[PDB]
Amino acid sequence: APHLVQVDAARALWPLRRFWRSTGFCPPYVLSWDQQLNLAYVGAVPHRGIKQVRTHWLLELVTTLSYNFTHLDGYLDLLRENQLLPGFELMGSASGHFTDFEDKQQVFEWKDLVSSLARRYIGRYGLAHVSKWNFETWNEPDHHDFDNVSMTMQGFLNYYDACSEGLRAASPALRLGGPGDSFHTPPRSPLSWGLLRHCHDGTNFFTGEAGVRLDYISLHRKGARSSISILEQEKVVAQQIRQLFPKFADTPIYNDEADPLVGWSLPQPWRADVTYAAMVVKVIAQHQNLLLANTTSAFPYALLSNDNAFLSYHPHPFAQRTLTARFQVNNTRPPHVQLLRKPVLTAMGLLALLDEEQLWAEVSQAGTVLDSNHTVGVLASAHRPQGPADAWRAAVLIYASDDTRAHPNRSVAVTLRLRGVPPGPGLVYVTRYLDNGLCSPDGEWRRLGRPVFPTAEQFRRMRAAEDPVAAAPRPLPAGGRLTLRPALRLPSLLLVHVCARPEKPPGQVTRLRALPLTQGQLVLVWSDEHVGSKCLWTYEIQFSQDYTPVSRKPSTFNLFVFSPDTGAVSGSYRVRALDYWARPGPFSDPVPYLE
Numbered sequence: 124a125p126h127l128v129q130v131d132a133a134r135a136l137w138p139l140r141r142f143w144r145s146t147g148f149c150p151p152y153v154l155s156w157d158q159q160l161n162l163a164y165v166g167a168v169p170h171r172g173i174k175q176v177r178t179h180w181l182l183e184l185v186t187t188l189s190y191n192f193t194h195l196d197g198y199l200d201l202l203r204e205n206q207l208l209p210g211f212e213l214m215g216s217a218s219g220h221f222t223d224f225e226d227k228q229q230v231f232e233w234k235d236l237v238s239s240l241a242r243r244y245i246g247r248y249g250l251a252h253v254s255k256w257n258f259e260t261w262n263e264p265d266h267h268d269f270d271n272v273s274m275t276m277q278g279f280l281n282y283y284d285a286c287s288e289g290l291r292a293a294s295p296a297l298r299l300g301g302p303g304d305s306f307h308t309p310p311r312s313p314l315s316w317g318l319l320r321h322c323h324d325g326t327n328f329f330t331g332e333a334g335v336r337l338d339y340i341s342l343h344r345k346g347a348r349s350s351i352s353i354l355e356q357e358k359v360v361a362q363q364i365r366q367l368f369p370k371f372a373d374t375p376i377y378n379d380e381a382d383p384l385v386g387w388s389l390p391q392p393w394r395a396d397v398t399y400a401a402m403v404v405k406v407i408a409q410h411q412n413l414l415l416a417n418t419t420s421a422f423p424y425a426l427l428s429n430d431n432a433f434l435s436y437h438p439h440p441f442a443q444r445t446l447t448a449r450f451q452v453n454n455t456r457p458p459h460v461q462l463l464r465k466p467v468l469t470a471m472g473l474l475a476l477l478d479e480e481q482l483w484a485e486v487s488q489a490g491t492v493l494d495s496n497h498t499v500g501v502l503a504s505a506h507r508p509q510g511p512a513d514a515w516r517a518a519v520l521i522y523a524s525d526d527t528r529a530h531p532n533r534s535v536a537v538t539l540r541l542r543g544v545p546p547g548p549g550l551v552y553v554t555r556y557l558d559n560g561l562c563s564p565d566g567e568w569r570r571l572g573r574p575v576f577p578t579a580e581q582f583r584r585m586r587a588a589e590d591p592v593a594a595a596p597r598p599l600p601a602g603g604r605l606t607l608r609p610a611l612r613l614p615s616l617l618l619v620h621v622c623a624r625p626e627k628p629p630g631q632v633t634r635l636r637a638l639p640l641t642q643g644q645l646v647l648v649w650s651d652e653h654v655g656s657k658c659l660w661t662y663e664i665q666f667s668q669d670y671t672p673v674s675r676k677p678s679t680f681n682l683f684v685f686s687p688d689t690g691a692v693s694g695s696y697r698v699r700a701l702d703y704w705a706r707p708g709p710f711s712d713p714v715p716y717l718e
């Protein structure tokens with residue numbers, strides 16, 4: 124019997140925050156050509172769909188009393204160039220200098236280091252930007268990963284107070300949290316529980332005052348292939364924190380490593396394709412629906428980060444826990460690197476269209492009501508018009524997902540009954556579907572016979588599977604209703620996007636950049652910050668050899684790899700937005716390129 128999905132667009136229940144807009148990684152690198160492409164792909168998720176890159180070992184990019192910040196400056200400018208913030212873990216030895224946080228002098232030096240860097244980047248980027256940064260403790264302090272740095276229980280607390288007072292010395296507006304570990308039952312996780320105790324009741328290393336600032340609590344809990352299992356473990360740890368530390372009852376909780384499965388470099392086929400994309404959406408829906416949508420408990424859950432900004436390696440380009448799939452093409456002169464957009468990364472573009480208010484929705488099957496702890500579920504949002512640039516919008520994101528298990532011999536009948544759409548001008552809807560058959564670059568890779576060093580043409584073919592199948596904007600039926608009976612595969616993702624015609628056309632594409640890949644090939648990447656509306660069919664690219672349209676199937680992702688048959692790519696480029704009512708926005712400033 125079919126899955127009934129009902130959405131009521133009149134009933135805008137509560138706020139829907141985009142709490143999931145974070146990725147991260149650990150260098151084994153951070154300024155190679157590979158990482159510049161990668162963070163361009165990450166930064167190109169539309170509508171700031173990924174905003175934070177939680178990065179380990181950032182203070183190994185600082186060398187040594189005075190410090191050389193050159194390499195840090197590099198990585199951070201790279202993030203800034205891609206409209207990305209660092210999840211700034213205060214993690215590193217300053218290339219060998221710090222060795223012992225029970226050595227009182229080192230504690231004082233750490234504080235002065237933190238003040239220096241914080242004040243430096245306040246200088247470089249401005250305080251308003253640096254105040255958005257999640258400064259954090261050293262990663263997983265109970266997982267013994269300090270290298271040649273002695274970090275005892277007491278030293279961790281000294282370390283923390285220096286982090287806190289150091290940031291404060293730069294500005295009180297800067298945010299700090301921790302410990303970023305799992306919080307297992309005591310006697311386990313001594314440094315994690317000890318930090319909370321110290322902040323709640325302990326004494327400041329520098330000031331002697333009782334209590335120490337702690338702006339958020341970060342944990343890590345992973346699913347062991349179960350999606351719901353991440354939420355169950357979070358609840359337990361959050362309840363324990365509430366009862367044991369009453370002053371942290373309202374302290375925001377982050378799960379900044381909320382991955383389906385521990386071990387990023389373990390090859391898993393489900394990490395290659397939509398199986399993973401659909402599960403990441405499921406996890407997020409579960410979190411919104413079964414934790415934040417006015418539950419009796421109401422824990423203060425504020426951030427989920429999928430730690431998947433790693434670069435893949437041979438012979439597992441797709442099978443690793445990464446947003447991109449990397450190919451090091453060693454047989455060109457010179458060797459070059461290409462990345463493809465994995466479905467998981469494209470899925471972050473779908474999640475990005477969700478707006479600021481959740482709508483009422485219910486999934487059922489033969490009358491039995493099913494919450495997000497099932498294979499099929501939904502997240503629906505509504506947008507309140509802000510100016511002439513936008514109108515009302517609904518985004519309805521449905522998933523079919525059996526966690527890490529795919530079922531290719533399976534179809535799932537789904538009837539979507541949308542009702543109560545507030546009436547208005549030129550109401551159109553647009554579908555966007557993703558599954559393994561139609562949208563798996565991994566799939567095409569395998570149809571082509573798994574080329575280890577893909578040719579130009581094989582890359583085009585693979586890149587054809589990156590975007591969702593998109594139906595042209597049809598108009599909305601009378602009465603503000605819409606019924607649809609799509610068949611969904613398992614896994615799959617379906618985004619129904621209902622939008623009203625805004626008064627003005629789209630705003631100007633900005634910050635266009637050209638990036639070389641190899642002979643005859645390049646990447647175009649831009650920012651959608653001033654486009655001012657999410658109702659977008661595609662981005663129209665034009666090339667000039669002393670302007671004509673580059674013909675390509677529609678795509679809202681703010682990155683295009685230009686690879687024409689002719690190899691002709693030297694000249695100038697410009698890009699503009701095209702909306703669901705065919706209206707054009709103003710062309711970006713023209714970008715020049717010469718191979």
Ligand SMILES: *[C@@H]1O[C@H](CO)[C@@H](O[C@@H]2O[C@H](CO)[C@@H](O[C@@H]3O[C@H](CO[C@H]4O[C@H](CO)[C@@H](O)[C@H](O)[C@@H]4O)[C@@H](O)[C@H](O[C@H]4O[C@H](CO)[C@@H](O)[C@H](O)[C@@H]4O)[C@@H]3O)[C@H](O)[C@H]2NC(C)=O)[C@H](O)[C@H]1NC(C)=O
Nearest residue numbers: 150151388435436437438439450451452453454458575576
């Ligand atoms: C095209 O040319 C590039 C060079 O530009 C080659 O790139 C190398 O590819 C290999 C994989 O084939 C990479 O080596 C692998 O690195 C992994 C990560 O290494 C880090 O982490 C581990 C511990 O987790 C540390 O030991 C290590 O020092 C690093 O810090 C390792 O996990 C891999 O080990 C596994 O695979 C090898 C076999 O490949 C086994 O021997 C091991 O036992 C283990 O199972 C592996 O070492 C390497 O890093 C890449 N180098 C660069 C510079 O990118 C491409 O391989 C080449 N392409 C082709 C097709 O030849």
Ligand SMILES: *[C@@H]1O[C@H](CO)[C@@H](O[C@@H]2O[C@H](CO)[C@@H](O)[C@H](O)[C@H]2NC(C)=O)[C@H](O)[C@H]1NC(C)=O
Nearest residue numbers: 351352354355356358409413494495496497498
């Ligand atoms: C999510 O659903 C699963 C079932 O798929 C629940 O697990 C069951 O929990 C009950 C207790 O209510 C136990 O009696 C069963 O043994 C469990 N069954 C299985 C198959 O695991 C789970 O509790 C649900 N969790 C949430 C948060 O909704």
Ligand SMILES: *[C@@H]1O[C@H](CO)[C@@H](O)[C@H](O)[C@H]1NC(C)=O
Nearest residue numbers: 185186187190191192193194
């Ligand atoms: C800082 O480090 C960079 C990279 O190692 C180096 O090129 C530069 O000369 C150094 N600058 C100073 C002032 O020491």
Ligand SMILES: O=C(O)[C@@H]1O[C@@H](O)[C@H](O)[C@@H](O)[C@@H]1O
Nearest residue numbers: 148149262385386387388430
């Ligand atoms: O699951 C993994 O591979 C890892 O978990 C932790 O140990 C690390 O902090 C992450 O860098 C990584 O996501």
Ligand SMILES: [Cl-]
Nearest residue numbers: 382383384444
């Ligand atoms: Cl995973």
